[PDB]
Write a protein that binds this ligand. Structure first.
Ligand SMILES: *Cc1c(COP(=O)(O)O)cnc(C)c1O
Ligand SMILES: *Cc1c(COP(=O)(O)O)cnc(C)c1O
Ligand SMILES: N[C@@H](Cc1c[nH]c2ccccc12)C(=O)O
Ligand SMILES: N[C@@H](Cc1c[nH]c2ccccc12)C(=O)O
Ligand SMILES: O=P(O)(O)OC[C@@H](O)CO
Ligand SMILES: O=P(O)(O)OC[C@@H](O)CO
Ligand code: NA
Ligand code: NA
Lengths: 267, 396, 396, 267
C-alpha cells in the first residue's frame, strides 16, 4: 500500500520519485544504517536495498565491491532482516524494496523468505535472476504476504512481455535503461517513451527507470518521458567507496547528491 | 514460452536476468533448427571426423582386470584433438554461433581445458574468442593460459568474489547480458540455464552412441554399467545419453571426494550439497547455511565446481543413475595404476571414474561384469601435480 | 648372409661388432616371418586401431592457405596415442620381441618421446623396459623422464662422451651386445644397422598408405608432394614409402637448420654432413675433419641427431626425394601460425615440415599445388620452450 | 711377417703371447709413449693400440674413460700415427696391432688409412664395428699394404663363421672370451677348447684370447686350452686410471703386472 500512497502523493505534487539503492551492511552495519537515514533525510522517496550475495551476476564492479565490503564486515542475511525491521520502524511511510538474488530467497524456503519480509515491513521484492517466465512461485509467495512482486521491462521487450509485466507486477515496474549490468559509467541510449506508454495502456504498475542513472538531468528526462521516477544505485555506491576513509564526509556527499537528484524529479 | 522443457523434473530452468531471456530463446530455436538441418549435421560430422579425430577407440584393458571377472573398456576421449572430450561440444556450439550470425565467443574456464577447447574452435572457424578465468586459476594454470593465447584467444582474469570458476561464470554472464546480439556464450558443461544442459548433452552424445555400437561389435551385448566422472556433467551425460532407455545398463557418475566428504573439502554437491538457484539453474549446490555459494575442492581442477548439471540431479532423483564419490588418493592410485599396466596416462578427472571401476572390480572380484569407463581426457597435463604430491610424500 | 639387402645403394649395412651379428640375423628372420604371418598382422592392426587410435585423420587447412592456390592437408599423427608417430613402430617392435621370445626391451632416447613410446608399449605388452638417455637430456627432459617412470620403465642416465643421444645410442648397443638372448633393442628411428631401417619403415608405412587412400577419397588424385621432417627419418619414410613408386608425387624431407647452416649449429647431415660409418650404418653424418662424431643442434630435441637413415641418403642420391632445411625461427613461425589459424599446436619437429610447406606456398602463391604435411606429433610438450624464447625476445 | 716370426719363436720356447692393450695418448702423448715402452720392457710380446674415438661402442667404462682422457689431452689420429712411427722405430720386431672404429678408417679413405698404417709400420688392424660380413673393402685395403686383417671369433660362432675367419684372417685370430663389451671386472665363462681346435683344423691364424683377461691364471688357462696367447686391455688401463696422480708409480705398477702376466704365458 506504500507504493500506491507514494505515487498518489507524488502525482498530486506533479513530482517523480527518486529511489536510491545501497547494499545492506556496506561498509558496515552501523554506517549503512547511518547511510540509509541520510538518503531519506536528503529526500529519497523510496529505498531499494540489496542483501550481500557471494555471486551478484547482474552487478558491475561498483556493486560487486559493495557486496565484497559487506562480506568483509561479516554481514549475514539474518543481520539484514534485523536492519530492515529497524529501518521500517524508523520510517513508517517510505516504500522499502529488496533487490535479491534467487538463492537467498530459495535457501530457507521461498514462502519463509517472503513471510520474513512481511514481518519486517518490506514492501516489494525484486529477484534479479528470476525472469517473468520463472516467477510463478516467487510472486505467489510475495502476494500471500502482501509483498509486491517487481518485474523488469527491458528495452527490447516485445508486446507479450509488456502484458505479463503489467498483469503480474505490483508496486512499481522496473524500467530497464539498457542491456548489460549495473554501473553509473554506462548510460542507456534508447528512448523508452514507447515502452512507458505501452505500460500505461496495459495498466502496469508505475515505471521506475534504473541502470545508469547518475545525474540530475537523467532523473528529469525519465520523468519527462512519462516514467514515475528513477532508480540510482552505482552512483550512490561510488560515493560510499570514494569516502570509505571519512565516514562523515561520506554522509555529507550522499546528502548533496540525493538532494540534487530529488530536486530534479520536480516537474 | 520455450520450444523444449527447460526442466528435468524439478531441476534446471532459466534463472537469468530478464535481459538475457531473448538470448536463451534465440539459442534454443537455433539449436532445434540445427538438429533438423542435415547441412548442419554434415558440417558438424565433418569437423568431428576430419579435425577432432572421431570416432575414438574403445580400448579393452586386459592387464588392469587380471585375476578378476571384470572386463573393462575405456572410451578413449583422451585421443580426441585437444586431449579431452570438451572438443566435441565446442565445435557444435561454434557452428551454432555462426548459424545465429554471431562472430564473437564468450567462455568461462577454471582448469583451462574448456578455455583451450573454446580457443581452438574459435581459431578454426574464424571467431573472436574472449575467455574469463578466475585470477587464482590464471596463476594455477599458466600452461593452459599460454595455449589459449597461442591460438589467439583473449584471456581475462577475474578478481571478483573468490576469483575462481564460479566467479568467471558470473563475469561471462555479465558480459553476455550486454553483448548477446553479436557474441555467443560458449558455456563449458551440461549445466547453467536452459537450453545449455540439453545442447551440451546432444553435442556430446556421440560418446555413448559410439560406445554402444563398439561394445556390441566387440562383446555382442550392452555393458552392465558405464562410469564417468562428474564435474559439471558433460562427459558423463554424453556417455549416459544413448543408454538411458536401456534400463539394464547401469549409469554411474563419480563426483570428486577431495580430501574426504567428512572434511568438507570436496566437490560432490549432487550427493552432499543442497538444492539452490545459481548460474541460471536450480540444482544441487555446495553452499553455506545462509545460501552463499561455497567453494569446492578436488585434486583435479576440471572437477572443481560447486554445482552440477540438472539432468544428473534428475536421473539420481528417479534412480535411473547412481552417483558416488572418489577421493584424491583413490584417483591418484587409479592414475598410477593405468600408467603402469596399460601405458595410458589418464586425466586426473577421468582417474576418478577409473578409481570407482577399480573399486567395483576389487571389492567383488568374482562378480562377472562388463564395465565401460569414459576416459574423458589424457593426463600429460597432470604429471606436474602428480609429481609434486609423490615428491612431498617421499614416494619419489 | 642376410634375407634382405642391407644396403640402400651405397648406404646402410650392418656395421656392428661381430658379437651382435646373430642378434641382427635373428631380428631380420623374425621380421620377414612376421610380415608373412596373418596372425601377426591382425594383432598389430588390433593394437594400432583399438589402442593407438588408427586410422588418424587427414585434416584440410583452409585458413592456412587463404589467398594462395595451395591446398594443404595435415596427416594427423599428433592424434595418435602418445602424441607422436613413434607409437606405430614401437607396437610392432614389441610384438617382434615377443615373437622372438624376448621379455626385456632396450631403448635409447634423446628428446624423450621414443622413451615414452617404448615405455607404454612395454607396459601394455608385459615387457621389462630399460631406457638409456644422455645425462644432459635427462636434465632437459624432466617431464618425459617422469612419464617413462610412471609407466614402469627404468631410465638410465648416460654420462659418457657428450652425454646426449649418440652416447645413449652407444650404451644401448653396449648393453645389447651382452644381453640379446633375452632383451630386444627397440631402436627409435629408421636408422642404425640392418634390418632396423627396413623394419621401422614397414612399421610406419601405414602413415603414407592411409594418406594415399584419404587424399584419393577427398581430392580424387595423388598429392603433388608430401613433406615431413627428418631427424632420424622414421616419420618421413613412413609417409614416403607408399608413394615411392608414384613418380609424380614429390617427396620432400626437412632437416633442422638450427641457427643457420653457415653457423655450423644445425642438424642437417644429409645435405651438409659427410658420409661416415657409425651407429651400425654407413650414412651422412655431422663429423669433425678427423672423423669424430660431431654434435648437432636444433630448437627441436626430436630432430637433434648427428646422422640420418640410409634410405633417405639413397633416395636423395638417385633424385627420388629432395631434402631441404628449416631454421629455428622458421619452425617457430610455423608453430605460431598453425596455432592461430587452425587451432592445432604442432610439435616443433613437425613445425619444420610445415614451415617448408608455408615457404612453398608463400614464395609461389599462384602455383596450384596439393600438399600433404605429415604432422608427426602435437606441440603441448613444446609450449615451455616456445614461451621462454618469446619471453626472452620481448615478444611476450 | 712379424706375427709369423713371433709365434714361431714363442712356439720354439713352448710359450704363449701376452699382448696388452692401451689407448694411444692416454693420459697424454709423452706418458703414453713411456707407458708403451714400459709394457715392452716388462715382457709384452705384441701391442694392441687404440686410436681415441668419440663413440667407442664396444668398450666398457674403463676404456671409455681412456678415450675420454686422451680427448682431454687433445690427441688426434694424426698424432697417433706419429706415435706409431716412433714406436715402430724404437721396437723393430714387436707386432703392432691397431684396434680401430670404422669411421676413423673410412674418414680419409679406406685405402689411405691402411697406406698410412704401412708407412708407419703397423702389422695388423682390427676394426671393432666391422663384422666379417662387411669386411671385404677393409681386408682388401689391408692386404694391399701388407696389413693383417684381424677377425673376431665369438664364443657363439657357427661353423660357417669359423671357416670365414680362418680363410680371411691373417696375423692372429681374436678369440672372444664372452659377449658384452670390454671390461676386466667381467670374465668369460665358456670353455673355448672346441673353437680353438676348430680354428686349428681350418688353418686359422693363431688365436689370441681377449675380453676379461686380468689375472695370470687366465693367461695360463688360455695357453693350456690351446690358444697362442691372451690379450689384456682393461686390466692395463685400470692401472693407468689408478695412478693418474703418480706417473712414476704408474710405470712401476704396469711393469709388475705385465711381468706377472707374461710369466704366466710360459708353459
Ligand atoms: C573438464 C573435464 C571434465 C569435467 O567436465 P564435465 O562437464 O563434468 O564432463 C572431466 N574430464 C576431463 C578430461 C575434463 O577436461
Ligand atoms: C621423434 C620425432 C621426430 C623425429 O623422428 P624421426 O625418426 O626423424 O621421424 C619427428 N616428429 C616427432 C613428433 C617426433 O616425436
Ligand atoms: N573447469 C573445467 C571444466 C568447466 C568449464 N566450465 C565449467 C562450468 C561448470 C563446471 C565445470 C566447468 C575447465 O575450465 O576446463
Ligand atoms: N630424439 C628423439 C627421436 C629419436 C630416438 N632415437 C633416435 C635415434 C636417432 C635419431 C632420432 C632418434 C627421441 O628420443 O624421442
Ligand atoms: O547501479 P545502477 O546502474 O544505477 O543500477 C541500479 C541498480 O543499482 C539498482 O536497481
Ligand atoms: O678390456 P678387455 O676386457 O681386456 O678386452 C680387451 C680389449 O681391451 C682389447 O682387445
Ligand atoms: Na561439481
Ligand atoms: Na639427423
Amino acid at each position: 500500500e506504500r507504493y500506491e500512497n507514494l505515487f498518489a502523493q507524488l502525482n498530486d505534487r506533479r513530482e517523480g520519485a527518486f529511489v536510491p539503492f545501497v547494499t545492506l551492511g556496506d561498509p558496515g552495519i552501523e554506517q549503512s544504517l547511518k547511510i540509509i537515514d541520510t538518503l531519506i533525510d536528503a529526500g529519497a522517496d523510496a529505498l531499494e536495498l540489496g542483501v550481500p550475495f557471494s555471486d551478484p551476476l547482474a552487478d558491475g564492479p561498483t556493486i560487486q565491491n559493495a557486496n565484497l565490503r559487506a562480506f568483509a564486515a561479516g554481514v549475514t542475511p539474518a543481520q539484514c532482516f534485523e536492519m530492515l525491521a529497524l529501518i521500517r520502524e524508523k520510517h513508517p511511510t517510505i516504500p522499502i524494496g529488496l533487490l535479491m538474488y534467487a538463492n537467498l530467497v530459495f535457501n530457507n524456503g521461498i514462502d519463509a523468505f517472503y513471510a520474513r519480509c512481511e514481518q519486517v515491513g518490506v514492501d516489494s521484492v525484486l529477484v534479479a535472476d528470476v525472469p517473468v517466465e520463472e516467477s510463478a512461485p516467487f510472486r505467489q509467495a510475495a502476494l500471500r504476504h502482501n509483498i509486491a512482486p517487481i518485474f523488469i521491462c527491458p528495452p527490447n521487450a516485445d508486446d507479450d512481455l509488456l502484458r505479463q509485466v503489467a498483469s503480474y507486477g505490483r508496486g512499481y515496474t522496473y524500467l530497464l535503461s539498457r542491456s548489460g549490468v549495473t554501473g553509473a559509467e554506462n548510460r542507456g541510449a534508447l528512448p523508452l517513451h514507447h515502452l512507458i506508454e505501452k505500460l500505461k495502456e496495459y495498466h502496469a504498475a508505475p515505471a521506475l527507470q534504473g541502470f545508469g542513472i547518475s545525474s540530475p538531468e537523467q532523473v528529469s528526462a525519465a520523468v519527462r518521458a512519462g516514467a514515475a521516477g528513477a532508480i540510482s544505485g552505482s552512483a550512490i555506491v561510488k560515493i560510499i567507496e570514494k569516502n570509505l576513509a571519512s565516514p562523515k564526509q561520506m554522509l555529507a556527499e550522499l546528502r548533496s547528491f540525493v538532494s540534487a537528484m530529488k530536486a530534479a524529479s520536480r516537474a | 514460452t520455450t520450444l523444449l522443457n527447460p526442466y528435468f523434473g524439478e531441476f534446471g530452468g532459466m534463472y537469468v536476468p530478464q535481459i538475457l531471456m531473448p538470448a536463451l530463446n534465440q539459442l534454443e530455436e537455433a539449436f532445434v533448427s540445427a538438429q533438423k538441418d542435415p547441412e548442419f549435421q554434415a558440417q558438424f560430422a565433418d569437423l568431428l571426423k576430419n579435425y577432432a579425430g572421431r570416432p575414438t577407440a574403445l580400448t579393452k584393458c586386459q592387464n588392469i582386470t587380471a585375476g578378476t571377472r571384470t572386463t573393462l573398456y575405456l572410451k578413449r576421449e583422451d585421443l580426441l584433438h585437444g586431449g579431452a572430450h570438451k572438443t566435441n561440444q565446442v565445435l557444435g556450439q561454434a557452428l551454432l554461433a555462426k548459424r545465429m550470425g554471431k562472430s564473437e565467443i564468450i567462455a568461462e574456464t577454471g582448469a583451462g581445458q574448456h578455455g583451450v577447447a573454446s580457443a581452438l574452435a574459435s581459431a578454426l572457424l574464424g571467431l573472436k574468442c574472449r575467455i574469463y578465468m578466475g585470477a587464482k586459476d590464471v596463476e594455477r594454470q599458466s600452461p593452459n593460459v599460454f595455449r589459449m593465447r597461442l591460438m589467439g584467444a583473449e584471456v581475462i582474469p577475474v578478481h571478483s568474489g573468490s576469483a575462481t570458476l564460479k566467479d568467471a561464470c558470473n563475469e561471462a554472464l555479465r558480459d553476455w547480458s550486454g553483448s548477446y546480439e553479436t557474441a555467443h556464450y560458449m558455456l563449458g558443461t551440461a549445466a547453467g540455464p536452459h537450453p545449455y544442459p540439453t545442447i551440451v548433452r546432444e553435442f556430446q552424445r556421440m560418446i555413448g552412441e559410439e560406445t554402444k555400437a563398439q561394445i556390441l561389435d566387440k562383446e555382442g551385448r550392452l555393458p552392465d554399467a558405464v562410469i564417468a566422472c562428474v564435474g559439471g556433467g558433460s562427459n558423463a551425460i554424453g556417455m549416459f545419453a544413448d543408454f538411458i532407455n536401456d534400463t539394464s545398463v547401469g549409469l554411474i557418475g563419480v563426483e570428486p571426494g577431495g580430501h574426504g566428504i567428512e572434511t568438507g573439502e570436496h566437490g560432490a554437491p549432487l550427493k552432499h550439497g543442497r538444492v539452490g538457484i545459481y548460474f541460471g539453474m536450480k540444482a544441487p549446490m555446495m553452499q553455506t547455511a545462509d545460501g552463499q555459494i561455497e567453494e569446492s575442492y578436488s585434486i583435479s581442477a576440471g572437477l572443481d565446481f560447486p554445482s552440477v548439471g540438472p539432468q544428473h540431479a534428475y536421473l539420481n532423483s528417479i534412480g535411473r543413475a547412481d552417483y558416488v564419490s572418489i577421493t584424491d588418493d583413490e584417483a591418484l592410485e587409479a592414475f598410477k595404476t593405468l600408467c603402469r599396466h596399460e601405458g595410458i596416462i589418464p586425466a586426473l578427472e577421468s582417474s576418478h571414474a577409473l578409481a570407482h571401476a577399480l573399486k567395483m572390480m576389487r571389492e567383488q572380484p568374482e562378480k562377472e561384469q562388463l564395465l565401460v569407463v569414459n576416459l574423458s581426457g589424457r593426463g600429460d597435463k597432470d604429471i606436474f601435480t602428480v609429481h609434486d604430491i609423490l615428491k612431498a610424500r617421499g614416494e619419489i
